[PDB]
Amino acid sequence: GTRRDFLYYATAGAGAVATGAAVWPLINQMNPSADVQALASIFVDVSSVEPGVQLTVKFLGKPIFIRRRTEADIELGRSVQLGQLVDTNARNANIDAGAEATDQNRTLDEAGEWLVMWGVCTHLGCSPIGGVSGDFGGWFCPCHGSHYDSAGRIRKGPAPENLPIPLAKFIDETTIQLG
Amino acid sequence: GTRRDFLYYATAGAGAVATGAAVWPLINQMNPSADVQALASIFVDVSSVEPGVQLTVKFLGKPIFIRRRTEADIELGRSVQLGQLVDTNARNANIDAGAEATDQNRTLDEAGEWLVMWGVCTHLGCSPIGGVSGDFGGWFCPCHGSHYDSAGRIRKGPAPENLPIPLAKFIDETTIQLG
Amino acid sequence: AGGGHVEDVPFSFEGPFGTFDQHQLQRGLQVYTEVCAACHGMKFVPIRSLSEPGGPELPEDQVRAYATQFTVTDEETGEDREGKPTDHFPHSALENAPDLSLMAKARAGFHGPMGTGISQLFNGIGGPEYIYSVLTGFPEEPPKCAEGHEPDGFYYNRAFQNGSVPDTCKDANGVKTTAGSWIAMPPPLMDDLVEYADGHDASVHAMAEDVSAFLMWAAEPKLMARKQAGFTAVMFLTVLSVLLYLTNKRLWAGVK
Amino acid sequence: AGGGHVEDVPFSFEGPFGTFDQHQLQRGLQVYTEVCAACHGMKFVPIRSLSEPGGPELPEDQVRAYATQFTVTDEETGEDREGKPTDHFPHSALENAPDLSLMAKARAGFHGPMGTGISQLFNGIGGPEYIYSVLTGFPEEPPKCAEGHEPDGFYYNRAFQNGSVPDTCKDANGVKTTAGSWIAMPPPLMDDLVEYADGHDASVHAMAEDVSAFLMWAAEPKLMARKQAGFTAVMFLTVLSVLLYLTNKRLWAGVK
Amino acid sequence: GIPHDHYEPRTGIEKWLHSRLPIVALAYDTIMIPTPRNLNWMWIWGVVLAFCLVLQIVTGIVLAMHYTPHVDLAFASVEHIMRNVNGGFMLRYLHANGASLFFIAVYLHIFRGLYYGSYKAPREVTWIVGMLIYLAMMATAFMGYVLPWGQMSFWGATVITGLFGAIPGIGHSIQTWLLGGPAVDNATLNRFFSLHYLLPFVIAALVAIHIWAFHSTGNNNPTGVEVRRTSKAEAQKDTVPFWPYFIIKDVFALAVVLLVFFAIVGFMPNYLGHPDNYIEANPLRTPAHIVPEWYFLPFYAILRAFTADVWVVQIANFISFGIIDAKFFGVLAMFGAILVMALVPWLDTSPVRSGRYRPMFKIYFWLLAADFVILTWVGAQQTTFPYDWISLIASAYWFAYFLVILPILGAIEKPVAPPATIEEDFNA
Amino acid sequence: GIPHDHYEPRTGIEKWLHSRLPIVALAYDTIMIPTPRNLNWMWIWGVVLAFCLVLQIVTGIVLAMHYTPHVDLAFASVEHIMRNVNGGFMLRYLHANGASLFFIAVYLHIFRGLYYGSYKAPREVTWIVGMLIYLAMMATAFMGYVLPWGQMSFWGATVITGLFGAIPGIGHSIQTWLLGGPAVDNATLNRFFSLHYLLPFVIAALVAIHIWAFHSTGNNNPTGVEVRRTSKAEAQKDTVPFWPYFIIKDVFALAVVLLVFFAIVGFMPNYLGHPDNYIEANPLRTPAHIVPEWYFLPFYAILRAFTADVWVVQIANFISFGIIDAKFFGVLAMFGAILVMALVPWLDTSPVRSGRYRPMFKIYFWLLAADFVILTWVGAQQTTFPYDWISLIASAYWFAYFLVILPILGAIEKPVAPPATIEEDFNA
Numbered sequence A, B: 001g002t003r004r005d006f007l008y009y010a011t012a013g014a015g016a017v018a019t020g021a022a023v024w025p026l027i028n029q030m031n032p033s034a035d036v037q038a039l040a041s042i043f044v045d046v047s048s049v050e051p052g053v054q055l056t057v058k059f060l061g062k063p064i065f066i067r068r069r070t071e072a073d074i075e076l077g078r079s080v081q082l083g084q085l086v087d088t089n090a091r092n093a094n095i096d097a098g099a100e101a102t103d104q105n106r107t108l109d110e111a112g113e114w115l116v117m118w119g120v121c122t123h124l125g126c127s128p129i130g131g132v133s134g135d136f137g138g139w140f141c142p143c144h145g146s147h148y149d150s151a152g153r154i155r156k157g158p159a160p161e162n163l164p165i166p167l168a169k170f171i172d173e174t175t176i177q178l179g
Numbered sequence C, D: 001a002g003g004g005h006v007e008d009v010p011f012s013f014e015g016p017f018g019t020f021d022q023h024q025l026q027r028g029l030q031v032y033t034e035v036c037a038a039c040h041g042m043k044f045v046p047i048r049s050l051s052e053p054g055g056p057e058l059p060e061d062q063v064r065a066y067a068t069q070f071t072v073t074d075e076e077t078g079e080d081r082e083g084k085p086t087d088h089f090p091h092s093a094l095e096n097a098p099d100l101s102l103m104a105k106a107r108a109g110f111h112g113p114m115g116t117g118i119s120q121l122f123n124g125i126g127g128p129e130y131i132y133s134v135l136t137g138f139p140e141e142p143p144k145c146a147e148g149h150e151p152d153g154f155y156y157n158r159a160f161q162n163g164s165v166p167d168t169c170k171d172a173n174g175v176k177t178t179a180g181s182w183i184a185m186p187p188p189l190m191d192d193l194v195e196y197a198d199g200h201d202a203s204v205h206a207m208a209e210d211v212s213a214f215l216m217w218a219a220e221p222k223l224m225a226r227k228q229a230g231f232t233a234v235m236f237l238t239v240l241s242v243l244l245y246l247t248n249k250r251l252w253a254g255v256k
Numbered sequence E, F: 001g002i003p004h005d006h007y008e009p010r011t012g013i014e015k016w017l018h019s020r021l022p023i024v025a026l027a028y029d030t031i032m033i034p035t036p037r038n039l040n041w042m043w044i045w046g047v048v049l050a051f052c053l054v055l056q057i058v059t060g061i062v063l064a065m066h067y068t069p070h071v072d073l074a075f076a077s078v079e080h081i082m083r084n085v086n087g088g089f090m091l092r093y094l095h096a097n098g099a100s101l102f103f104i105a106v107y108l109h110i111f112r113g114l115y116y117g118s119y120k121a122p123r124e125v126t127w128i129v130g131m132l133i134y135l136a137m138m139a140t141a142f143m144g145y146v147l148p149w150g151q152m153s154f155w156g157a158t159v160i161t162g163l164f165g166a167i168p169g170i171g172h173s174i175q176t177w178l179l180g181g182p183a184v185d186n187a188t189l190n191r192f193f194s195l196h197y198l199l200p201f202v203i204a205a206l207v208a209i210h211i212w213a214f215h216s217t218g219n220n221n222p223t224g225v226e227v228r229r230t231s232k233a234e235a236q237k238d239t240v241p242f243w244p245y246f247i248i249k250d251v252f253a254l255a256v257v258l259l260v261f262f263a264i265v266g267f268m269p270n271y272l273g274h275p276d277n278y279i280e281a282n283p284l285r286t287p288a289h290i291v292p293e294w295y296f297l298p299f300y301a302i303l304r305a306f307t308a309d310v311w312v313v314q315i316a317n318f319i320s321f322g323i324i325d326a327k328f329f330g331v332l333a334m335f336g337a338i339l340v341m342a343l344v345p346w347l348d349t350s351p352v353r354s355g356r357y358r359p360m361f362k363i364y365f366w367l368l369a370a371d372f373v374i375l376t377w378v379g380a381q382q383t384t385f386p387y388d389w390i391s392l393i394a395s396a397y398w399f400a401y402f403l404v405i406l407p408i409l410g411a412i413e414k415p416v417a418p419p420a421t422i423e424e425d426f427n428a
């Protein structure tokens, strides 16, 4: 053969390497800016949160729900058999990744009064309407019809998982610290 | 002839009329919006203005100079024959429009102490340098080399007129009101 | 959900030849200033538009005077001052009171029949009509249903639709049985709460009808301009069409 | 117009293989904080960049601690608070003190010879070197010329060029005779005004040299990134060129 | 490839210009192309689309001159364009309803194609290029709507970037990249502005090739019978020069359309839009009545028909070991509803071009048409019964029509007698 | 018009695609056009320009995704693109020096043309279109520079919109309209953003026609002799197919250029710019050292040579009853310096194409070249003596060259013997 057929490759080759090195940064520039990535954590004051009230707060640009549940609210949460849930995973970042969607496992406390979760429907993103609304006494996502129950578990609609619980924890008697 | 040759004109004509009605608003939208045209007048505090000092203030987005002149400054202004100046009009909005570029005609007081003019070079727009600079003990426009004298008269360069004096007047012992 | 009843009011401006009533707007402006303004802002409405033609059309001296009644914070200085007419009405005073700037456009009062939007095509969106109803919609007595189960702090409204409703007023499926629901806005009006210079009646009916025409204009200032623009475009094109038609007809004539 | 003298310091970052000195920047940051910061701000520099690689590179806990000294006004609340490292250094405290964010870039210290800019091509734009000079350019005594005719509130500076000069130091045509001119910035440095932890000398010479390297970085944080990017681009292309060359040569070979 | 006559330099300026750059020549051959004598009103949508693309672009540049793409000023900026900018209030509304007219036109244009076999060979490229244009149009129309930064703007921005979150595996990445962050925020609004600007020029470029393609294939007529290509003589029997015969027809039609269009823009500029977008964007509340833009409704209906509990969704979810669940199925169902339409040239096996001569086809076609209208209508109702059902059957009939019905009719159906020439049909 | 063979469908995909839309065909005839065998390194600037236009446009869209056109955020926004955006610091610098390379290229490109008579018939259209492209380039390059909103940005914005204020009568209107107000403010910045975006697509469109024009005229060589058009045989003797002979030569050149370009962007990104633009725009101060962008210097020199006290200015002012004074003269002088160059096809009366064979021309040409460099150099000095003189003589020689010298050399000068064929020259 020839070593000329090699050159016409070592060339076209080095070319394609440059073109790539060019294209990459033109793509990567769209990824999060050094400042968007610098976002950290926040602290929320739950002094006024009366039971039966939901507190909506902004964190990382998405809404975060903080409901202090009623007895009625906790009743139903605890009366659902795990296998009647559509999603079985707790989707809770505080507990193990394999935990089970048991109301008891979706609250911050043992009394299961403090439900803290991302008010971000898992279907496509809307913030589901609260106020003990929907078909399961939870939240209703108006975008495509997803219903969540009093523990924030998906129970009907396109949504595939339960509303996630973000790293949260009470750092004193009246303050939770998300993130 | 024909009345068909008329129609092919009454048509192409009505056409050109619409196209115009279209093109106009597309051009007119660039003219000053209702928010810019609402700009009115302002009041300036000349308390601290020591003689030999220039106060630069914004008004209508352009800078407005307020110099309290020294004796030296008024000396030279008065020592020039109108026929020696390039621009002969006072360009003073307070006095008559046909006034003459005599230092006395370009100051607000009779003492010739208060020189109030637009710090907008008449050549192309820059704000000429102050603090007695230039070759006529006035202002120097760094953009294209125009020199103005202690009375703000053009004496050299591309600038064709003297810095204009805007409607101004003392409304008390320490406050001038431009516009 | 949220598809309820709204009182069709025959506003002067509804219609292709409709036009604002320079005096209504004026009255309305008084109601907004003496009642609404207390809680609701109008942050997108420059006070000087009060002078602009096709609206309340007050003379600059008044407008300049009016604007004085606001305590604006100057952007350059940072310190407070008198309000110039080049300033925008302030924000809503009451933090949960919505801005009324665009409010006449951000609400529908006529929702199509079969959900076919044919009711809106013939009656307009009904935004002013809706705001009208919300004002003239506070009845003296709650629906028998809510007796005793009324949320404290809210008030029943015969037109408001997105409010909370007592458990006792939802039927077998959750749907509410009452025509309206509970707002957080205590009924604003009450006969002659405002006294119009010329004595024109201050019945909660009229006042509400006026602040509406005003709020309509606050939101759509170029309404008349737009409509005049409409006409013109239609004439230009009704002619250009007829002509273009003949030119067409009398051209294919030499083929078919 | 203008154009003066600037001390050509041999900075570590000057050069195609130049790199910031992690410690200089660290020291410089201390000088900026303990001296300059008093009047100058750095409003385009996010405090958290102190952590970012290729610069001072302080650990987050420190940076987080540092950011605490500043009293920022939170945009959402409106009320003041401790400074987070996600905050930008404050604005200049002293209203007529320029921002130092971009100073080493907004200044030239090497002006071409015949006005040909060939002096800048071989020495850089000398911004850090100019800031250096302005700091180490406050002599104790004005030039005998201005004796008594010293504008008040100003200080002579051997490097500063855009300041005012006494009538007595202008020659026959107006041109100043003094190497420098009159600044409004009272000489800020004076030997050992700052105590570096490791004892490193705090001679006004060193301090000024350090705050410069820091001020250089404050303005050009991706200096190193840019240069690495440079090399890469040059290798890719020095190779692709040689290859494209041969491909060319060994192709026209079949013609000429 | 029809037989006509080419450019002949007349004046001197023409002979001069011609020997250097034949811009005049080519523009002539383009404006004089022979086109079928029979062409009903359904052939005017191609022009209404061209005009819209131009209307949108100029009113756009103009609006971009006053709009600021930044979350804190964006909404305000548009209200300013409305109240201050000279005639802004009417330019804004023209750009907005321009999108609506743009789609009403592209659908009428599309269905015209489905019925007359305008996608059937040799016009298979015209169709795919047109199909790309369609995709671009929506992508654009979407980003535009995000700009005012209202309630619909913000959440539609949230939901549409969400569709890429549905993609298995890479999905979370594709989404973070589109958003430039962890949520729809300024970084998003800003990049959307830059792209909303850029896309229309890309569309324009395709429209050039779209035109080039049908120009180098000859137009189609309601007959499906091509123009006789064997002699300038009989070719002229089937045709008529584009200019002025059809430009006047088209411009005339374009005037009547615009007549109605301005009637809308002047008298009911807000009819076709959503009142909730006059509400500033709120990151913590999703409007209870959030509904898509009418021209998106049908594909929206299809996406939400497929919920967790749909038999076929269930089966797929099963045989996919979970990967294809309800969410991602609706995404695939929607995009697929479009991809299926892009393949019509290869699913409609009947060799008869115009469906005017396919008595069986005519029926499934009008059902498709009724389905699209129904689909659109459903997108606007809640997800409760019987809408969930109606939506399901409708989505079903859509794929039914392209994937099963058309392939079958191709083999079954007994075609009717199509005129032997355009000529004989025109004279009729 | 050079004799050559054509594309023919080989594969099936090619025969399928060809009978529908010959995109492959046309792309072939374009990439295979026969071009003169002799073509020195001065013919590579056409490509370097194409590349720059693309480089500028992509890095532009990218930058537009992060920049906010609003006076209060505009400058900050660019510093953000520098410190936060992933690789922004290097994209910003690329766009900025991209402008420089773009001009260094267009000037080398232009002078190449002036010397070889590339503007002389039949290439007269290539020239005018290229001339329009040149005007657009500056208009663009200007608006771009305004966007960072620094000191030079603000004042250059003030001064350039000022040139329209110079136009007698209408001038104050033309200016208020450009500014959207009584001063360069936000309204201006905002509309400039929208136009800076739009113009490049217009340039792109012209470059299409620029290419189309020289493609349908055949390239020019350093000889001025055309390619023999009488036989595929002798045509091939003078030519060589563009691809791959010249694409490799051009791409190779383009690599060496880019090598140096990246060296600049990486190591001295700020060399070619003005330090004062890292100072936020100040409406109340004009930087003492305000100087234009280097690529504008020459036309800037010419404008400020003509002051109130220049003999012609006065003669002019006199005869023109005041109307044409010093200010408006400089404006006319500058724009005229460009308009004069656009007319070269009708001022250079010598019928000899390449100036390689015009011994008398060669001297005035290199003076023109030296004048342009001098002109550039002067724009950067103060208006004091002797610069005011140098600038004057220089501006003078510019018009001298196009308005007098070229027309005269046409009649005087004794030409040299140009090779009879490109072949004879190549072989040499």
Ligand code: HEM
Binding pocket: D031, D032, D035, D036, D037, D038, D039, D040, D094, D096, D097, D098, D103, D107, D131, D134, D135, D163, D182, D183, D184, D185, D186, D188, D189, D211
């Ligand atoms: C070592 C810390 C400091 C550094 C590096 C520094 C640097 C500078 C620089 C480079 C300039 C501008 C020179 C130019 O325009 O070319 C300047 C101006 C100024 N500085 Fe500082 N400075 C420092 C400390 C201070 C302090 C402590 C004050 C306040 C007491 C101060 C007040 C000013 C003022 C008022 C100006 C304006 C002077 C003028 O332009 O006339 N500086 N400084």
Ligand code: HEM
Binding pocket: E053, E056, E057, E058, E059, E060, E061, E062, E063, E064, E065, E067, E078, E092, E095, E096, E098, E099, E102, E137, E140, E141, E142, E143, E144, E145, E146, E147, E148, E196, E197, E199, E200, E203, E277
């Ligand atoms: C493919 C043609 C285009 C379509 C279908 C389109 C559609 C739209 C839509 C649906 C909106 C939102 C309506 C609203 O304002 O509520 C919009 C907004 C906007 N578009 Fe376009 N657009 C097109 C081309 C352009 C172009 C070429 C530009 C840039 C030159 C542009 C600039 C804008 C701007 C600035 C806005 C925001 C202001 C506004 O709300 O109108 N558009 N566009």
Ligand code: HEM
Binding pocket: E042, E043, E044, E045, E046, E047, E049, E050, E051, E053, E106, E109, E110, E113, E118, E119, E123, E126, E127, E128, E129, E130, E131, E132, E133, E134, E203, E207, E210, E214, E217, E218, E219, E220, E221
């Ligand atoms: C930018 C929007 C569009 C414009 C401006 C446009 C324009 C045109 C024009 C002028 C024609 C010729 C006249 C006619 O027969 O109607 C045409 C034909 C056609 N277009 Fe479009 N079109 C657009 C979008 C589309 C879309 C979305 C499709 C569907 C994918 C499409 C498919 C076709 C087809 C199949 C034809 C028939 C061509 C023939 O008869 O050979 N076009 N288009």
Ligand code: HEM
Binding pocket: F042, F043, F044, F045, F046, F047, F049, F050, F053, F106, F109, F110, F113, F118, F119, F123, F126, F127, F129, F130, F131, F132, F133, F134, F203, F207, F210, F213, F214, F217, F218, F219, F220
């Ligand atoms: C957007 C920048 C431009 C691009 C992309 C462009 C591109 C080209 C290309 C690719 C060629 C052929 C290769 C070559 O000769 O280098 C060319 C030739 C030419 N260009 Fe340009 N050009 C540009 C601007 C200009 C300008 C500003 C002028 C003069 C005002 C001009 C005048 C010419 C002429 C006279 C030719 C020779 C054509 C012939 O031989 O018939 N071009 N240009």
Ligand code: HEM
Binding pocket: F053, F056, F057, F058, F059, F060, F061, F063, F064, F067, F078, F092, F095, F096, F098, F099, F102, F137, F140, F141, F142, F143, F144, F145, F146, F147, F148, F196, F197, F198, F199, F200, F203
């Ligand atoms: C004709 C090719 C182009 C040229 C010659 C050009 C030139 C320029 C120049 C000289 C600047 C100032 C750069 C600086 O020194 O900071 C600039 C800035 C900018 N250009 Fe372009 N530009 C071009 C195309 C584009 C395109 C297609 C876009 C997309 C809209 C664009 C967007 C921008 C933006 C957003 C800025 C401001 C931020 C910055 O780059 O500093 N440019 N452009």
Ligand SMILES: C/C=C(C)/C=C/C=C/[C@H](OC)[C@@H](C)[C@@H](OC)[C@@H](C)CCc1oc2c(O)c(OC)cc(OC)c2c(=O)c1C
Binding pocket: A143, A144, E135, E136, E138, E139, E142, E152, E153, E155, E156, E157, E159, E160, E161, E178, E195, E290, E291, E292, E293, E296, E299, E300, E303, E334, E335
């Ligand atoms: C840079 C990023 C880009 C280019 C992203 C491009 C995506 C492009 C697609 O077009 C190709 C896409 C617009 C197209 O999908 C085929 C549409 C029919 C999407 C349909 C659509 O609209 C909605 C909408 O408008 C809303 O408003 C309030 C709200 C919505 O939920 C509540 C939806 C929605 O749920 C869906 C499915």
Ligand SMILES: C/C=C(C)/C=C/C=C/[C@H](OC)[C@@H](C)[C@@H](OC)[C@@H](C)CCc1oc2c(O)c(OC)cc(OC)c2c(=O)c1C
Binding pocket: B143, B144, F135, F138, F139, F142, F152, F153, F155, F156, F157, F159, F160, F161, F178, F195, F290, F291, F292, F293, F296, F299, F300, F303, F334, F335
């Ligand atoms: C909406 C569209 C608009 C407004 C288009 C405007 C286009 C304008 C022209 O293009 C035709 C223009 C760029 C071109 O004239 C041929 C240049 C040679 C102008 C040269 C130019 O630059 C300056 C400059 O850059 C400055 O900044 C620091 C400051 C300046 O004063 C000192 C100037 C200046 O005095 C001149 C003459």
Ligand code: FES
Binding pocket: A121, A122, A123, A124, A125, A126, A141, A142, A143, A144, A145, A146, A157, A158, A159
């Ligand atoms: S995003 Fe919640 S139902 Fe779709």
Ligand code: FES
Binding pocket: B121, B122, B123, B124, B125, B126, B141, B142, B143, B144, B145, B146, B157, B158, B159
């Ligand atoms: S604008 Fe002042 S000298 Fe030209």
